């Protein structure tokens, strides 16, 4: 029990962070109807991007 509580505490300490989108070629970047919230992103007008 002590080892398992220490493992849970150390796993909180070893804190990684996942991301929503990890690529410009994402399947989320095909259609926002693929998931239930339609997310949104734009660019600056008349820009090089």
């Amino acid at each position: 029990l002590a080892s398992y509580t220490a493992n849970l505490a150390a796993f909180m300490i070893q804190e990684e962070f996942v991301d929503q989108v990890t690529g410009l070629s994402d399947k989320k970047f095909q259609r926002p109807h693929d998931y239930s919230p339609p997310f949104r992103f734009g660019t600056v007008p008349n820009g090089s991007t």
Binding site: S3, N7, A10, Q14
Partner: protein, 40 residues
């Protein structure tokens, strides 16, 4: 993606010596129990 992006704590650490020590304690304890059975 061909070479750069392609690349090549836990519970295993706190189990091995503990398991072996408890197993050796069980092996010694069974013999001590049979000594106590021979005593009574």
């Amino acid at each position: 993606k061909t070479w750069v992006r392609y690349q090549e704590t836990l519970t295993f650490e706190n189990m091995a010596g503990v398991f072996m020590l408890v197993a050796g304690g069980i092996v010694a304890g069974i013999f001590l129990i049979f000594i106590e059975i021979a005593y009574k």
